[PDB]
């Protein structure tokens, strides 16, 4: 796990994944149906959707008929009115562990290739605003029909007043993206963010056009905390077999390093984390 990077950035958290088990101080699983109203899994923290094997964290998806831990908790009908779902998967978030603002993040991951799947790398912005206001930076997103496709986008609010979600994405080809690791990259100045597959550039965007109407003032110069998940369906994906064929499958990341410069952890210090003004 090496220390330094030159442009003198230097490690300040992240996981090799090597331990005896996930680190609860790290990590933590979400539990149930958390989004989508068209997927077809539930989260749970058991070890046969979460666990370190071969020196990855591992998130392995079962077609197998599972209790909604939500199902009448949460304030979302069709969360709350589904009891089972077919497929059990897992995802981690630092939602409780860890806040970025501004560096280099790095995420090795070798992506499962089935009917469904939807393996994401992803960060939500933690500030007064809710989705899509706050901001959403996906590093990975790979949909089964069109599986050699990563997507990578910014989600936002046009203003700072509709809620409506004003995104920009792109995309790269990777030929069999799912034989070999690669490593997602995401470089976030208070200028940019650029989100690489591999030191090929997915998608930039200039933060000097995500400022918000009035004061309100960008959420992408205020904290995010990162989620890596595989989700199954989705209103835009596929949905996976009724029968549960291709399952089960595995979502490998190899690891996860944040960097930063004096510069990164300087920016950081001159902003309201709740709004993003200086
Ligand atoms: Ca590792």
């Known amino acids: 796990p090496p220390r330094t990077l030159p442009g003198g950035w230097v490690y300040v958290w992240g996981d090799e994944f090597n331990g005896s088990r996930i680190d609860a101080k790290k990590w933590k699983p979400e539990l149930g149906v958390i989004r989508n109203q068209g997927s077809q899994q539930t989260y749970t923290g058991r070890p046969k959707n979460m666990r370190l ?12 008929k599972f209790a909604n831990v939500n199902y009448k908790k949460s304030s979302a009908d069709w969360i709350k009115n589904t009891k089972f779902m077919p497929y059990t998967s897992g995802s981690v978030t630092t939602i409780k562990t860890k806040n970025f603002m501004f ?14 799947i939807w393996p994401a790398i992803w960060l939500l912005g933690k500030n007064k605003w809710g989705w899509p206001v706050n901001g959403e930076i996906d590093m990975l997103e790979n949909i089964s029909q069109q599986p050699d496709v990563v997507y990578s986008t910014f989600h936002l609010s046009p203003d700072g007043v509709s809620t409506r979600d004003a ?7 990777i030929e069999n993206l799912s034989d070999d690791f690669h490593t ?8 940019s963010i650029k989100l690489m ?7 930039s965007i200039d933060l000097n056009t995500t400022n918000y109407a009035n004061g309100a003032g960008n959420p992408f110069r205020t904290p995010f ?15 996976a ?18 960097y930063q410069t004096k510069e990164h952890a300087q920016q950081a210090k001159q902003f309201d984390p709740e709004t993003g003004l200086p």
């Open 53 to 64: 094997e071969d020196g990855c964290l591992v998130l392995e998806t079962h077609f197998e």
């Open 103 to 116: 560096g280099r993040l790095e995420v090795r991951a070798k992506v499962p290739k089935t009917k469904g």
């Open 167 to 173: 995104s920009r994405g792109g995309t790269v080809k």
């Open 184 to 191: 997602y990259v995401m470089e976030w100045d208070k200028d």
């Open 197 to 203: 597959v591999d030191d090929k550039l997915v998608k």
């Open 225 to 239: 905390y990162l989620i890596l998940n595989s989700a199954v369906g989705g209103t835009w994906c596929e949905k």
């Open 241 to 258: 077999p009724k029968d549960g064929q291709g399952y089960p499958v595995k979502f490998l990341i190899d690891y996860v390093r944040f």
